[PDB]
Design a protein around this ligand. Structure first.
Ligand SMILES: [Cl-]
Ligand SMILES: [Cl-]
Lengths: 122, 122
C-alpha cells in the first residue's frame, strides 16, 4: 500500500553512506590522506603556495595585473610539482577509488530506477 | 571487523533504487508519462518531428546543408511547441521531481561520506 516518503529515502541514503564509509576504498583514502600530512616536500610546497596566494590577493586588490599573472603562474608551477610527489599520486589514486564508488552507486540507482519506469509503461 | 565490499554497497544501492521506484515522485512521473501518450496534439507534433528527422538524415548525407539547416530550425520550432502543451509541462515537472530526488540522494551520500572522512582525520 504505502509509498516511501522522501524522508524514508534520505534516511536509507544515510545508511548507504555509513556502509560506504566502512569500505576498503574509504579506508585507503583515510590512510593515503594521513601520509600526505607527514611528507616534508608536501609541507614545503603547500607553504610556498599559501604565501603566494597571500601576495596574489594583495596584487589583485592594487590591480598589479602583470605581477598577479607571474604569481598565478608560480602557484600553477608548484601545484604541478605537488602532483609528481608519490604520496600525492597515491592520495589521487585513493580519491579516484572513492569518487568511482560514489559514481557507481549513483549510476546503479539511476539505471535501475529508469529500468523499473520503462517496464511500468506497458 | 570486516569492511563492506563494493558488491555489498551496490546490492544496497539496488535496495535504495527499489524504494525510490515506490515513491510519490516516481508514481507522479509514471502517471504524467501515461497522459502524454494519450494526447492528440503531442502525437501530431512528435510525428511531424520524426518525418523531419528522416529528411534531415537524407539532406546531411547529400550535403544539402542550407536545406538541412531549415529542417533543423523546423524541428527546433516543433520542440518548443511541444513544451507549451500542459500535459508536457506536467510531465517536465514530474521529471524534475524524480531528478531532484536522485540528486538529493547523491548529495546526501556525498556530504555524509565527506563529513565522516573529515571527522576521521583527527
Ligand atoms: Cl539497466
Ligand atoms: Cl555535512
Amino acid at each position: 500500500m504505502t509509498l516511501y516518503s522522501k524522508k524514508d529515502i534520505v534516511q536509507q541514503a544515510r545508511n548507504l553512506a555509513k556502509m560506504i564509509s566502512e569500505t576498503e576504498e574509504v579506508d585507503f583514502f583515510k590512510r593515503a590522506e594521513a601520509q600526505i600530512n607527514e611528507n616534508d616536500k608536501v609541507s614545503t610546497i603547500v607553504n610556498q603556495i599559501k604565501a603566494l596566494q597571500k601576495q596574489a590577493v594583495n596584487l589583485k586588490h592594487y590591480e598589479k595585473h602583470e605581477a598577479l599573472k607571474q604569481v598565478e603562474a608560480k602557484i600553477d608551477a608548484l601545484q604541478e610539482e605537488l602532483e609528481e610527489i608519490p604520496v600525492i599520486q597515491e592520495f589521487r589514486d585513493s580519491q579516484m577509488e572513492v569518487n568511482d564508488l560514489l559514481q557507481l552507486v549513483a549510476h546503479t540507482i539511476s539505471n535501475q530506477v529508469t529500468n523499473e519506469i520503462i517496464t511500468s509503461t506497458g
